[PDB]
């Protein structure tokens, strides 16, 4: 169909235009809450680690999709491999609090510690970008912090995720006509 292209009103033609038939679609895998709900690894600091989803690398599935939203909300689960006991403090806590074990402290139990944590920021939602300094995000954009004698692995998992105002999501720029890769296949 033709239309006024200057308008942002979406136009979605279908194959029925030339005699085809539109099929049924099942889009559960592109549901935001479902797709963000899985663990992703970040490289940890030795002891004190601020819980900040922007640490998730931008090329990962979770990191790229998170960056494709401007504002977001979620609760969180973390899985941590650590020596010693692990202490968590909420958003707004003095860093010294990390040495006091009345703050949620999980005693070491092999092979790792998994915890469910609530959102604790003072804002109604957080943002992946913030036009203040025109990089740096306000200090209040975090889910608290953790500390152990040694933290060797740290995974984040967004729960009940909500996203607002989509932003660019980019695939790899290929050099040839098509980006080609080795796909899994039965052997020789």
């Amino acid at each position: 169909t033709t239309s006024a292209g200057e308008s942002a009103d979406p136009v979605t033609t279908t194959v029925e235009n030339y005699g085809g038939e539109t099929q049924i679609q099942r889009r559960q895998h592109t549901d935001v809450s479902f797709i963000m709900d899985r663990f992703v690894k970040v490289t940890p600091q030795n002891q004190i680690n601020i819980l900040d989803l922007m640490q998730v690398p931008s090329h990962t599935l979770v990191g790229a999709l998170l960056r494709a939203s401007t504002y977001y909300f979620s609760d969180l689960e973390i899985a941590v491999k650590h020596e010693g006991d692990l202490t968590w403090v909420p958003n707004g806590a003095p860093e010294k609090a990390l040495d006091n074990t009345t703050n949620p402290t999980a005693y070491h139990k092999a092979p790792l510690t998994r915890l469910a944590l609530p959102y604790t920021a003072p804002h109604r939602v957080l943002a992946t970008v913030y036009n203040g300094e025109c990089r740096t995000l306000p200090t209040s954009f975090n889910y608290g912090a953790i500390k152990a004698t040694r933290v060797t692995e740290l995974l984040y998992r967004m729960k009940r995720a909500e996203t607002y105002c989509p932003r660019p999501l980019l695939a790899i720029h290929p050099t040839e006509a098509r980006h080609k890769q080795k796909i899994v296949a039965p052997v020789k």
Binding site: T1, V11, D75, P118, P166
Partner: protein
């Protein structure tokens, strides 16, 4: 909702498992996609 699949009730109260939402005093993109023009703009022949 999300990537969760247990049929049995969580052992912990909701008040502990997650933060609790509050209300003061809505899927924009779903409405936008649904509103898309899918017809034909002029006369159709044959």
């Amino acid at each position: 909702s999300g990537n969760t699949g247990s049929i049995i009730n969580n052992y912990y109260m909701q008040q502990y498992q997650n933060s609790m939402d509050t209300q003061l005093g809505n899927d924009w993109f779903s409405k936008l996609a649904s509103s898309a023009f899918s017809g034909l703009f002029g006369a159709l022949l044959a």
